[PDB]
Symmetry: C2
Subunit: 170 residues, 2 copies
């Protein structure tokens, strides 16, 4: 599998993955699917801020997964901290894609001079939690019942990675 | 006296807002705002049904205020709101924070909400203590996710389940 920046041609493939995570998982906390327009607007807002959108792609340019990050919280104080997300196409799980994607994302965030990457994972998702811990992420939050989906309460686990521990001041 | 905020209260609220922005770590911005910014905010909340409460004396002065809004922008977190309380410098030690928080909790509760989140700069022990004595629990401790005054700031998340008897949403 090849990792590269997303182009507008990749949006249809990204839409398929996104809408699946929406309807069958707790990787996204929305229950409503979106259209291509919605993902096009999202793609542009990202390019505007200088934030990357990476995709795991086929020789046949098929989208197997994608990753990206944006602001964590809407205040000037958190500009050094971004929140990312990685999604892999259902049939592609268990092949190491999430690792390749998350590793590439970390390198871009680091090249951008960013300071902290935050992951917001549903607590029961052991697969995702283990993937991150192996990449240096540490648990820093356990928030019970802050979310809901499929008719039940969901717990949130915050994991974070410091990209430059030697940097004493902003 | 604790009561809802009216447009005649915006000036006093902005005075408090801007003092917190310039002298403290209670707000995570370094730039002050005008009265128009606060008028828009006033309107945004009323539209969402979110309260804005003020502590006022006999003269009608704004001694402090509290409010809450969304915590995160996904439908999945609509039972959870992030709130914040601000008390005027010269009115601390008068138990006004306690009063504002209590009234806001009864508000969030009567409104069908499930959880109230507070984001507090980890070094602010007085604020953390005020929340503990009211049922809040530490649910997050994040190092260097913020910055202000030229230094890294740690954030502490504290939450309060408003109705644990409800096993499903």
């Amino acid at each position: 599998a090849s990792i590269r920046d997303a182009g507008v041609a990749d949006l249809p493939g990204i839409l398929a993955i996104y809408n699946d995570a929406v309807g069958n998982t707790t990787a996204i906390w929305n229950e409503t699917p979106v259209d291509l327009a919605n993902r096009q607007a999202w793609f542009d807002a990202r390019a505007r801020q200088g934030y990357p959108i990476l995709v795991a792609s086929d020789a046949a340019g098929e989208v197997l997964g994608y990753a990206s990050y944006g602001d964590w919280r809407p205040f000037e104080g958190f500009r050094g901290t971004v929140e990312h997300s990685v999604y892999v196409r259902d049939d592609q799980r268990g092949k190491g894609l999430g690792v390749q994607l998350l590793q590439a994302l970390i390198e871009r965030a680091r090249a951008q001079g960013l300071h902290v990457m935050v992951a917001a994972i549903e607590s029961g998702n052991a697969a995702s939690i283990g993937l991150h811990r192996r990449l240096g992420f540490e648990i820093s939050g356990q928030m019970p019942q802050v979310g809901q989906k499929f008719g039940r309460w969901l717990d949130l686990t915050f994991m974070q990675l410091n990209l430059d521990p030697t940097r004493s001041a902003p």
